[PDB]
Amino acid sequence: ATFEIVNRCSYTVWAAASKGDAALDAGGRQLNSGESWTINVEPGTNGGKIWARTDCYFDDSGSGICKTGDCGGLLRCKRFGRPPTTLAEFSLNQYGKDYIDISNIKGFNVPMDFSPTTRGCRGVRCAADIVGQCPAKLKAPGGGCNDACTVFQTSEYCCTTGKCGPTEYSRFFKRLCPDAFSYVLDKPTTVTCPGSSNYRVTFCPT
Ligand code: NA
Ligand code: NA
Ligand code: NA
Ligand code: NA
Ligand code: NA
């Protein structure tokens, strides 16, 4: 399946793509303002994610650091990124269908739209100014708006036991972005698409 990743932000981002234990395609690449990078994701990929990283430096071997979304200091991500990270999430060819969503469970760094480029289903978007409106206690000094599990490490925010409810913090993310997951047990905003659809992830869509 193809995913076109487009940076409409005014600043450079380093895109990343991983399924947690391996890179998807090359795993990461720099996108200057306006640039597009198309990756190929194997059919059947379960639990894949795409995100933006900000304020990165990499040496000529591909090793360095980013202030949001860093994946073990690699340009070409093999693992998931360090919060805060707005997440485009997907599982492909699961009993004939694809499933997509956007999640704020690991915080928010960059606004995003995640839409199919083929027929049969709708896209989802979280493009509100979550960083600007972020509650004081969730602001990350390194940049972005952390989720409450990252900040406070409680069973209630991290849903450790699989029993948890909404919180003042989760309701902030849900108010600004109703169509994204705000906590682990949120009422799902997953979209079902035809199996083998293709997609576009756009950073700073508005
Ligand atoms: Na992101
Ligand atoms: Na969603
Ligand atoms: Na997230
Ligand atoms: Na909530
Ligand atoms: Na898009």
Swiss-Prot record:
<dbReference type="InterPro" id="IPR001938">
    <property type="entry name" value="Thaumatin"/>
</dbReference>
<protein>
    <recommendedName>
        <fullName>Thaumatin I</fullName>
    </recommendedName>
</protein>
<feature type="disulfide bond">
    <location>
        <begin position="56"/>
        <end position="66"/>
    </location>
</feature>
<keyword id="KW-0732">Signal</keyword>
<feature type="disulfide bond">
    <location>
        <begin position="9"/>
        <end position="204"/>
    </location>
</feature>
<comment type="similarity">
    <text>Belongs to the thaumatin family.</text>
</comment>
<keyword id="KW-0968">Cytoplasmic vesicle</keyword>
<feature type="disulfide bond">
    <location>
        <begin position="149"/>
        <end position="158"/>
    </location>
</feature>
<feature type="disulfide bond">
    <location>
        <begin position="121"/>
        <end position="193"/>
    </location>
</feature>
<comment type="function">
    <text>Taste-modifying protein; intensely sweet-tasting. It is 100000 times sweeter than sucrose on a molar basis.</text>
</comment>
<keyword id="KW-0776">Taste-modifying protein</keyword>
<feature type="disulfide bond">
    <location>
        <begin position="159"/>
        <end position="164"/>
    </location>
</feature>
<keyword id="KW-1015">Disulfide bond</keyword>
<feature type="disulfide bond">
    <location>
        <begin position="71"/>
        <end position="77"/>
    </location>
</feature>
<feature type="disulfide bond">
    <location>
        <begin position="134"/>
        <end position="145"/>
    </location>
</feature>
<dbReference type="InterPro" id="IPR037176">
    <property type="entry name" value="Osmotin/thaumatin-like_sf"/>
</dbReference>
<dbReference type="GO" id="GO:0031410">
    <property type="term" value="C:cytoplasmic vesicle"/>
</dbReference>
<feature type="disulfide bond">
    <location>
        <begin position="126"/>
        <end position="177"/>
    </location>
</feature>
<dbReference type="Pfam" id="PF00314">
    <property type="entry name" value="Thaumatin"/>
</dbReference>
<dbReference type="InterPro" id="IPR017949">
    <property type="entry name" value="Thaumatin_CS"/>
</dbReference>
